[PDB]
Structure 1
Amino acid sequence: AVPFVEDWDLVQTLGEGAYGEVQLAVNRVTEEAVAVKIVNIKKEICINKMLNHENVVKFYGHRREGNIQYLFLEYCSGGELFDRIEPDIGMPEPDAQRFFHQLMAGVVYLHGIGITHRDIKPENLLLDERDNLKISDFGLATVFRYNNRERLLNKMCGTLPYVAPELLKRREFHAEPVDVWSCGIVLTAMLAGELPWDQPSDSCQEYSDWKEKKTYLNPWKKIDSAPLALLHKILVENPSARITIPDIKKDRWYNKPLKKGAKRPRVTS
Structure 2
Amino acid sequence: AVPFVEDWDLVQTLGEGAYGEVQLAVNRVTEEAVAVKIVDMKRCPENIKKEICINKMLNHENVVKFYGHRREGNIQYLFLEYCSGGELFDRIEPDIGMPEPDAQRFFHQLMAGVVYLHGIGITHRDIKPENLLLDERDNLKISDFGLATVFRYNNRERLLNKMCGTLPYVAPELLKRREFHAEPVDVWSCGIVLTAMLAGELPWDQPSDSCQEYSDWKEKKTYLNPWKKIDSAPLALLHKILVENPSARITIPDIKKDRWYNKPLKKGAKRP
The TM-score normalised by the length of structure 1 is: 0.98
Find the aligned partners of 2:271 and 2:64 in 1 and give their Cα distance.
26
1:157-213 per-position Cα deviation (integer Å, ceiling 9, x unaligned): 100000000000000000000000000000000000000000000000000000000
Secondary structure of the residue aligned to 1:10 is: strand
Instruction: Give the whole-Å Cα distance in 1 for the aligned partners of 2:222 and 2:152.
Output: 37
Deviation digits for residues 90-129 of structure 1 (CA, Å, limit 9, x no counterpart)? 0000000000000000000000000000000000000000
> Which residue of 175, 182, 185 corresponds with 1:175?
182
Match of 2:256 in 1: 249
Q: Deviations over 1:139-171 (max 9, x none)?
A: 000000000000000000100000000000000
- Give the deviation of 1:17 after TM superposition: 1.0
CA-based RMSD: 0.5
- Aligned equivalents of 2:4, 2:258: Cα separation in 1: 51
Q: CA deviation at 1:7?
A: 0.5
Deviation at 1:18, TM superposition (A): 2.1
Shift of 1:8: 0.5
Structure 1 window deviating more from structure 2 (227-236 vs 15-24): it is 15-24
Alpha-carbon separation, structure 2, partners of 1:205 and 1:134: 33
Percent of matched pairs sharing the same residue = 100
Looking at structure 2, the residues matched to 224 and 256 of structure 1 have their Cα atoms a distance apart, in angstroms, of: 13
Q: Which TM-score applies when normalising by structure 2?
A: 0.97
Give 2:21's aligned residue: 21
Counterpart-to-counterpart distance in 1, 2:58 and 2:225:
38
CA distance in 1, matches of 2:183, 2:28: 42
Superposed CA deviations along residues 230-267 of structure 1, whole A, max 9, x for unmatched, are 000000000000000000000000000000001126xx
State how many pairs are aligned.
Answer: 265
Partners of 2:206 and 2:236 in 1: how far apart?
Answer: 21
* Structure 2 counterpart of 1:214, from 218, 221, 224: 221
- 2: CA distance, partners of 1:238 / 1:218: 24
Structure 1 gaps, min length 5: none
Structure 1 residue ranges, 4+ long, deviating more than 3 angstroms after superposition: none
Distance in 1, matches of 2:25 and 2:189, equals: 31
Give deviations 1:33-84, integer Å, cap 9, x for gaps: 0000001100000000000000000000001000100000000000000000
